Amino acid sequence: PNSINLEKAAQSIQILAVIDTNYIKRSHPNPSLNAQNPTSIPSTALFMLNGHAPGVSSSEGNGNLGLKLNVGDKVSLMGTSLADNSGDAALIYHVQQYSGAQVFAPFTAVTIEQQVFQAFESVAKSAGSEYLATSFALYTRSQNRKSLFGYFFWVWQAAAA
Amino acid sequence: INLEKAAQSIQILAVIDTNYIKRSHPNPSLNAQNPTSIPSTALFMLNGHAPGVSSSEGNGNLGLKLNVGDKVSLMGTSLADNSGDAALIYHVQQYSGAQVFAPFTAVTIEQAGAASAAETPDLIATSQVFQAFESVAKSAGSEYLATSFALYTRSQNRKSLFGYFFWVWQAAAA
Amino acid sequence: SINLEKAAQSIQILAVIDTNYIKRSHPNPSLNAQNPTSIPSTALFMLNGHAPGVSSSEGNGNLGLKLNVGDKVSLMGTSLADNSGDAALIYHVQQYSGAQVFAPFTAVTIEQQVFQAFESVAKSAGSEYLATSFALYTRSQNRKSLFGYFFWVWQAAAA
Amino acid sequence: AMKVDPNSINLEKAAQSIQILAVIDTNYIKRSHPNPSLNAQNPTSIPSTALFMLNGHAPGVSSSEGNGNLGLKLNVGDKVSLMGTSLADNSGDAALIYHVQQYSGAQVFAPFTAVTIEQQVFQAFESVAKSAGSEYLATSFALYTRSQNRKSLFGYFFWVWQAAAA
Amino acid sequence: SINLEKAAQSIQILAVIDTNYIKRSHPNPSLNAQNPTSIPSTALFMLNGHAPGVSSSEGNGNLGLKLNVGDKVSLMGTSLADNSGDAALIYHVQQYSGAQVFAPFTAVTIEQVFQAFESVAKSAGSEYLATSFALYTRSQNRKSLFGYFFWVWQAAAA
Amino acid sequence: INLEKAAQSIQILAVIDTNYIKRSHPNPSLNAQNPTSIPSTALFMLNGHAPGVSSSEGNGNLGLKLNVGDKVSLMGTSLADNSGDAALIYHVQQYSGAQVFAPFTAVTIEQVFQAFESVAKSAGSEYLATSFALYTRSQNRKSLFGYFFWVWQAAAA
């Protein structure tokens, strides 16, 4: 009973934010064109997903995520549209603390080329609850050419133990 | 990056299945200082959306998560919107946990007069005084709140006390 | 042979509308009641009382109501602040898709302050999507003003 | 007291184009299905818990958002367009759909058509909900791994999801 | 020409009944097994194992099972303390509303003695099923009838 | 004003999909001191309703929120109620977070069952690991398939 050992390792968790760009376009017709002042959108406009691991849980689907993980766990966030950034493109450019404890280290952008991808990576360094704000640019495409629609952010919630 | 974080004002509605209560609690307390416990299964709680605010929409427990600073305003009604049986909140208090919310304040709201005829479909039938219970999140952590309400039944164009009841719900602030 | 005593249920349905969300996302809506503005089910919440053989996705704007053939329903609508500031008032319910599970809805007035409910009975088996139209008023200086006319589409099935 | 005619409330119902994204937890599949099929006409079954499905909102459209089974409810006349990706958006491992077919129930959907979308090349699998009823669909996909930047086929898999139209 | 090798699935379903909630909310229940007292689906949870083309609302007392025509089901019931204290024992399953998706159920005895209620989805459509059970309380190393109850749950086959 | 708040006794049932485990983890630990990790996806956790208690009913992770002072009693079983294959909990211990719960005690209930009981004695959030043995029904005998653990989440206020 005091001889049961449990292998306990740091997890590496992939998170994908899936954004309903059509919905956003419809509900925010005149958004910010300043990336330093992004337009707040509600969490109803997107979906967040993550892979399972021991000690990790979430409200899968919810744009809020409600992630609970272990101190020590690494996270990697990417964003895309419902058509996987094939038409409109939703492209995250920053992740920052919004409320609560500094659970996560400052996020680092990492590029992955081949199509260029970008993930935003951190580690749960402290126990607590934290709300994160993630900013993204939304582009449309017309003559097979991207054009900026606006800059937006949403807030999501995480906790580590 | 400027996010312009500001204190939100969240409206919360508790919708109580009064028929269910009356069937499951046929002999409840008639002393308002000693309300009858009901499960959160007997009601539903809803709240409006805001950045950094989430909940278990529909569940009587709510599971509200919001920002220190956010204001909340709580009202209660029945599944028939207090048109027959009425469920009327008279108190909110801390049940467990940190005092995340300030003690609540009852505020009286007078319903507006009607819109002009040009603005009202004839298809609509439309005096009420309402009460809401306001607070603000002021400390980080987790709190369980007890909300006590009077259940009145409609007898013949007249209300009669059925009983006093309370449920517990859960909230947290960051 | 066991006797369950199945009989018709009477289900109360409450639609709770996030009027502040609507006003923000549909700033120039329809002012024609014969032509309401579509809103997504994310902008409201639907609730119903429990009963034998009735289920739903409680709190979802779509409801996904599953009930018995023979069951009565009574629908009402209000805002998150219980129509005390902004007000959301149902004025019509109609078939949008699917089978004619429900009889045509009929408005009922309920006296003292004045309320209205929209009632029907599930007379056939199958799946039906229903559109509910409502007027949204804002309140300014103890007076109401029309903001716009909207509709949402919800889903129901009877067995 | 403005007259509203209850018999001409017009909702302007139109067919919706629903975009659906399947997000596959490829790391889970590799661990839990270490000996998959390498024959694409005989893909290996995976549980709907291995993946998430998401769809855009529209009137009369609903789903269990996030769930791999979807439980999609839509209008007869609507068009679905399905794409597939991993949790890392196919940047490392990649999950690529190659077929969608009827698995059980009514023929709600016409046979799906693969459509190319260009200016990376992207493919979506599209169909119109042509009849009322309930159908379960099987979607087959290839999972390719990258180890040390070497891309190879890991296996062919399929999951089943559910949809209904009225 | 893709072969899915579709096969009939055998789904295990477990109904877990919150017997304390029931006892406190139904002080005078039916004592006649032919007239069981209806309980709300909020009073229990239903669980099932996963399989291709099988889904449910996992944990909800109504279940919302969607399965394939040809799939078999086996239902068992137990309390939150696995029938070690209060016991919930199913004794019948029957059609409440809807189509005859499932054949009449067969009680099967398993050996320390359990009973399962088995059937097969023989027809496409939507069915509501009523499951009746006996709730017994544990007194002093002794079990006594508290009452007879049923709940209604929902299933569909395609 | 007076709510007569009472300490609650919460029964928790873990229902393990033994067929899923067998398929997913064909070569598990045969050493009970060193159980094999499984995803909370392979099981379901449920608990009784009570004031101040909530959970994500069904999820293998539970996400239980209860009150300091509340007792928990945990039992485990298969989707066939341990009538064929059997899943039998033999240990519960802290995995992560605050020590919200006292050490768990096994209690025998008399055909013979075992429960694992604790009380929430401090406020905070704790992850717990629960270990169990999975046995398969040979004919009318039991054979050991493997030892496993899953991780679930609880919080007290």
PDB file of C-alpha atoms in Angstrom, chain A residues 1-160:
ATOM      1  CA  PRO A   1       0.000   0.000   0.000  1.00  0.00           C
ATOM      2  CA  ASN A   2       3.028   2.200   0.479  1.00  0.00           C
ATOM      3  CA  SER A   3       4.705   0.215  -2.249  1.00  0.00           C
ATOM      4  CA  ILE A   4       2.661   1.289  -5.266  1.00  0.00           C
ATOM      5  CA  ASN A   5       4.816   3.297  -7.697  1.00  0.00           C
ATOM      6  CA  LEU A   6       3.352   5.375 -10.514  1.00  0.00           C
ATOM      7  CA  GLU A   7       5.342   6.395 -13.551  1.00  0.00           C
ATOM      8  CA  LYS A   8       4.764  10.131 -13.706  1.00  0.00           C
ATOM      9  CA  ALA A   9       6.187  12.029 -16.649  1.00  0.00           C
ATOM     10  CA  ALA A  10       5.854  15.503 -18.120  1.00  0.00           C
ATOM     11  CA  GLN A  11       3.190  15.524 -20.869  1.00  0.00           C
ATOM     12  CA  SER A  12       3.380  17.257 -24.205  1.00  0.00           C
ATOM     13  CA  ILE A  13      -0.111  18.487 -25.082  1.00  0.00           C
ATOM     14  CA  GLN A  14      -1.204  19.642 -28.540  1.00  0.00           C
ATOM     15  CA  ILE A  15      -4.053  22.261 -28.600  1.00  0.00           C
ATOM     16  CA  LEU A  16      -5.808  23.369 -31.781  1.00  0.00           C
ATOM     17  CA  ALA A  17      -8.134  26.344 -31.921  1.00  0.00           C
ATOM     18  CA  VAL A  18     -10.641  26.057 -34.717  1.00  0.00           C
ATOM     19  CA  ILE A  19     -12.171  29.384 -35.641  1.00  0.00           C
ATOM     20  CA  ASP A  20     -15.546  30.039 -37.360  1.00  0.00           C
ATOM     21  CA  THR A  21     -14.349  32.746 -39.620  1.00  0.00           C
ATOM     22  CA  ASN A  22     -17.726  33.195 -41.466  1.00  0.00           C
ATOM     23  CA  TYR A  23     -19.466  33.659 -38.174  1.00  0.00           C
ATOM     24  CA  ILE A  24     -16.788  36.260 -37.149  1.00  0.00           C
ATOM     25  CA  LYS A  25     -17.007  38.106 -40.414  1.00  0.00           C
ATOM     26  CA  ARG A  26     -20.810  38.331 -40.068  1.00  0.00           C
ATOM     27  CA  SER A  27     -20.803  39.482 -36.436  1.00  0.00           C
ATOM     28  CA  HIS A  28     -17.812  41.848 -36.685  1.00  0.00           C
ATOM     29  CA  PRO A  29     -18.184  43.724 -40.001  1.00  0.00           C
ATOM     30  CA  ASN A  30     -15.914  46.679 -38.983  1.00  0.00           C
ATOM     31  CA  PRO A  31     -13.079  45.141 -36.879  1.00  0.00           C
ATOM     32  CA  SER A  32      -9.788  46.573 -35.701  1.00  0.00           C
ATOM     33  CA  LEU A  33      -7.122  46.954 -38.392  1.00  0.00           C
ATOM     34  CA  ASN A  34      -4.578  47.517 -35.667  1.00  0.00           C
ATOM     35  CA  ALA A  35      -2.848  44.344 -34.503  1.00  0.00           C
ATOM     36  CA  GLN A  36      -1.807  46.129 -31.275  1.00  0.00           C
ATOM     37  CA  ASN A  37      -5.493  46.705 -30.457  1.00  0.00           C
ATOM     38  CA  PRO A  38      -7.313  43.466 -31.447  1.00  0.00           C
ATOM     39  CA  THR A  39     -11.153  43.198 -31.443  1.00  0.00           C
ATOM     40  CA  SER A  40     -12.525  40.995 -28.653  1.00  0.00           C
ATOM     41  CA  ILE A  41     -14.643  38.086 -29.879  1.00  0.00           C
ATOM     42  CA  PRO A  42     -16.720  35.743 -27.695  1.00  0.00           C
ATOM     43  CA  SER A  43     -15.609  32.171 -27.112  1.00  0.00           C
ATOM     44  CA  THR A  44     -18.734  31.018 -28.989  1.00  0.00           C
ATOM     45  CA  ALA A  45     -17.011  31.906 -32.241  1.00  0.00           C
ATOM     46  CA  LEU A  46     -14.459  29.106 -32.018  1.00  0.00           C
ATOM     47  CA  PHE A  47     -13.651  25.659 -30.767  1.00  0.00           C
ATOM     48  CA  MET A  48     -10.592  24.438 -28.826  1.00  0.00           C
ATOM     49  CA  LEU A  49      -9.419  20.879 -28.790  1.00  0.00           C
ATOM     50  CA  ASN A  50      -6.544  18.945 -27.105  1.00  0.00           C
ATOM     51  CA  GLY A  51      -5.117  15.474 -27.030  1.00  0.00           C
ATOM     52  CA  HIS A  52      -5.697  13.324 -23.971  1.00  0.00           C
ATOM     53  CA  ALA A  53      -3.064  12.437 -21.379  1.00  0.00           C
ATOM     54  CA  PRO A  54      -3.058  11.343 -17.702  1.00  0.00           C
ATOM     55  CA  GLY A  55      -3.951  14.251 -15.512  1.00  0.00           C
ATOM     56  CA  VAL A  56      -5.150  16.328 -18.383  1.00  0.00           C
ATOM     57  CA  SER A  57      -8.776  17.231 -19.018  1.00  0.00           C
ATOM     58  CA  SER A  58     -10.878  19.873 -20.750  1.00  0.00           C
ATOM     59  CA  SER A  59     -14.298  20.732 -22.124  1.00  0.00           C
ATOM     60  CA  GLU A  60     -13.417  19.471 -25.620  1.00  0.00           C
ATOM     61  CA  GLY A  61     -15.060  21.641 -28.289  1.00  0.00           C
ATOM     62  CA  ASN A  62     -15.600  24.656 -26.027  1.00  0.00           C
ATOM     63  CA  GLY A  63     -13.838  27.857 -27.229  1.00  0.00           C
ATOM     64  CA  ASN A  64     -13.042  28.391 -23.572  1.00  0.00           C
ATOM     65  CA  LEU A  65     -11.259  25.037 -23.308  1.00  0.00           C
ATOM     66  CA  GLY A  66     -11.265  24.926 -19.515  1.00  0.00           C
ATOM     67  CA  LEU A  67      -7.981  23.008 -19.582  1.00  0.00           C
ATOM     68  CA  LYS A  68      -6.654  21.322 -16.508  1.00  0.00           C
ATOM     69  CA  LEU A  69      -3.238  19.904 -16.587  1.00  0.00           C
ATOM     70  CA  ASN A  70      -0.175  19.056 -14.445  1.00  0.00           C
ATOM     71  CA  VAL A  71       2.600  21.383 -13.392  1.00  0.00           C
ATOM     72  CA  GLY A  72       5.440  20.525 -15.732  1.00  0.00           C
ATOM     73  CA  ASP A  73       3.290  19.828 -18.778  1.00  0.00           C
ATOM     74  CA  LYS A  74       4.219  21.474 -22.071  1.00  0.00           C
ATOM     75  CA  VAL A  75       1.468  22.934 -24.356  1.00  0.00           C
ATOM     76  CA  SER A  76       1.574  23.840 -28.078  1.00  0.00           C
ATOM     77  CA  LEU A  77      -1.209  25.993 -29.550  1.00  0.00           C
ATOM     78  CA  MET A  78      -2.134  26.311 -33.224  1.00  0.00           C
ATOM     79  CA  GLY A  79      -5.182  27.887 -34.854  1.00  0.00           C
ATOM     80  CA  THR A  80      -6.998  27.318 -38.088  1.00  0.00           C
ATOM     81  CA  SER A  81     -10.410  27.928 -39.743  1.00  0.00           C
ATOM     82  CA  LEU A  82     -13.189  25.368 -40.214  1.00  0.00           C
ATOM     83  CA  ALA A  83     -11.891  24.875 -43.827  1.00  0.00           C
ATOM     84  CA  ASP A  84      -8.364  24.440 -42.389  1.00  0.00           C
ATOM     85  CA  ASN A  85      -7.206  27.888 -43.538  1.00  0.00           C
ATOM     86  CA  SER A  86      -7.865  26.893 -47.144  1.00  0.00           C
ATOM     87  CA  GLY A  87     -10.078  29.980 -47.848  1.00  0.00           C
ATOM     88  CA  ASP A  88     -10.181  32.506 -45.060  1.00  0.00           C
ATOM     89  CA  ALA A  89      -7.173  32.009 -42.807  1.00  0.00           C
ATOM     90  CA  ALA A  90      -7.045  32.568 -39.105  1.00  0.00           C
ATOM     91  CA  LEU A  91      -3.478  33.053 -37.906  1.00  0.00           C
ATOM     92  CA  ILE A  92      -2.544  33.387 -34.285  1.00  0.00           C
ATOM     93  CA  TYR A  93       0.131  35.982 -33.486  1.00  0.00           C
ATOM     94  CA  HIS A  94       0.287  36.225 -29.751  1.00  0.00           C
ATOM     95  CA  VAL A  95      -0.719  34.528 -26.529  1.00  0.00           C
ATOM     96  CA  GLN A  96      -0.628  36.411 -23.251  1.00  0.00           C
ATOM     97  CA  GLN A  97      -1.832  36.329 -19.598  1.00  0.00           C
ATOM     98  CA  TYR A  98      -5.257  37.924 -19.173  1.00  0.00           C
ATOM     99  CA  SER A  99      -6.256  37.077 -15.619  1.00  0.00           C
ATOM    100  CA  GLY A 100      -5.175  35.099 -12.676  1.00  0.00           C
ATOM    101  CA  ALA A 101      -1.943  33.369 -11.816  1.00  0.00           C
ATOM    102  CA  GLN A 102       1.090  33.108 -14.110  1.00  0.00           C
ATOM    103  CA  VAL A 103       0.609  29.416 -14.601  1.00  0.00           C
ATOM    104  CA  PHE A 104       2.364  29.379 -17.935  1.00  0.00           C
ATOM    105  CA  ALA A 105       5.779  30.654 -18.929  1.00  0.00           C
ATOM    106  CA  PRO A 106       5.674  33.316 -21.625  1.00  0.00           C
ATOM    107  CA  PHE A 107       4.596  31.689 -24.850  1.00  0.00           C
ATOM    108  CA  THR A 108       7.255  31.197 -27.601  1.00  0.00           C
ATOM    109  CA  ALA A 109       6.387  31.240 -31.305  1.00  0.00           C
ATOM    110  CA  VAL A 110       7.858  28.321 -33.243  1.00  0.00           C
ATOM    111  CA  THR A 111       7.843  28.027 -37.008  1.00  0.00           C
ATOM    112  CA  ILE A 112       7.478  24.774 -38.942  1.00  0.00           C
ATOM    113  CA  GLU A 113       7.982  25.071 -42.722  1.00  0.00           C
ATOM    114  CA  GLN A 114       6.516  22.284 -44.953  1.00  0.00           C
ATOM    115  CA  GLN A 115       3.182  25.649 -46.154  1.00  0.00           C
ATOM    116  CA  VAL A 116       4.397  27.605 -43.176  1.00  0.00           C
ATOM    117  CA  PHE A 117       2.950  26.789 -39.708  1.00  0.00           C
ATOM    118  CA  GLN A 118       3.383  28.469 -36.404  1.00  0.00           C
ATOM    119  CA  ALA A 119       2.776  27.063 -32.907  1.00  0.00           C
ATOM    120  CA  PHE A 120       2.782  28.864 -29.640  1.00  0.00           C
ATOM    121  CA  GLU A 121       4.508  26.891 -26.985  1.00  0.00           C
ATOM    122  CA  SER A 122       4.752  27.069 -23.176  1.00  0.00           C
ATOM    123  CA  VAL A 123       5.153  25.055 -20.058  1.00  0.00           C
ATOM    124  CA  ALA A 124       2.912  24.933 -16.996  1.00  0.00           C
ATOM    125  CA  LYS A 125       5.495  26.257 -14.502  1.00  0.00           C
ATOM    126  CA  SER A 126       3.189  27.100 -11.541  1.00  0.00           C
ATOM    127  CA  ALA A 127       0.026  25.755  -9.842  1.00  0.00           C
ATOM    128  CA  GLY A 128      -2.991  27.903 -10.177  1.00  0.00           C
ATOM    129  CA  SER A 129      -5.626  29.141 -12.519  1.00  0.00           C
ATOM    130  CA  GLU A 130      -4.965  31.465 -15.486  1.00  0.00           C
ATOM    131  CA  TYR A 131      -6.975  33.088 -18.258  1.00  0.00           C
ATOM    132  CA  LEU A 132      -5.095  33.552 -21.538  1.00  0.00           C
ATOM    133  CA  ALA A 133      -5.844  35.868 -24.344  1.00  0.00           C
ATOM    134  CA  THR A 134      -4.893  34.799 -27.844  1.00  0.00           C
ATOM    135  CA  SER A 135      -4.776  37.282 -30.722  1.00  0.00           C
ATOM    136  CA  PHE A 136      -5.218  36.295 -34.368  1.00  0.00           C
ATOM    137  CA  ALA A 137      -5.412  37.896 -37.757  1.00  0.00           C
ATOM    138  CA  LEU A 138      -8.257  36.945 -40.079  1.00  0.00           C
ATOM    139  CA  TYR A 139      -7.628  37.085 -43.846  1.00  0.00           C
ATOM    140  CA  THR A 140      -9.933  36.546 -46.738  1.00  0.00           C
ATOM    141  CA  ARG A 141      -8.912  35.574 -50.226  1.00  0.00           C
ATOM    142  CA  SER A 142     -10.277  36.928 -53.515  1.00  0.00           C
ATOM    143  CA  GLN A 143      -8.298  36.840 -56.765  1.00  0.00           C
ATOM    144  CA  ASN A 144      -6.437  33.889 -55.201  1.00  0.00           C
ATOM    145  CA  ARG A 145      -4.949  36.665 -53.017  1.00  0.00           C
ATOM    146  CA  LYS A 146      -5.091  36.998 -49.194  1.00  0.00           C
ATOM    147  CA  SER A 147      -6.348  40.258 -47.779  1.00  0.00           C
ATOM    148  CA  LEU A 148      -6.630  41.386 -44.184  1.00  0.00           C
ATOM    149  CA  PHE A 149     -10.079  41.409 -42.609  1.00  0.00           C
ATOM    150  CA  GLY A 150      -9.112  42.262 -39.075  1.00  0.00           C
ATOM    151  CA  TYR A 151      -7.292  41.500 -35.843  1.00  0.00           C
ATOM    152  CA  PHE A 152      -9.167  39.732 -33.013  1.00  0.00           C
ATOM    153  CA  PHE A 153      -8.591  38.012 -29.673  1.00  0.00           C
ATOM    154  CA  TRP A 154     -10.497  35.599 -27.445  1.00  0.00           C
ATOM    155  CA  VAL A 155      -9.884  34.522 -23.912  1.00  0.00           C
ATOM    156  CA  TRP A 156      -9.611  30.993 -22.672  1.00  0.00           C
ATOM    157  CA  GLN A 157      -9.055  29.332 -19.290  1.00  0.00           C
ATOM    158  CA  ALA A 158      -6.460  26.956 -17.920  1.00  0.00           C
ATOM    159  CA  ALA A 159      -5.418  25.503 -14.589  1.00  0.00           C
ATOM    160  CA  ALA A 160      -2.459  23.467 -13.367  1.00  0.00           C
TER     161      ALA A 160
END
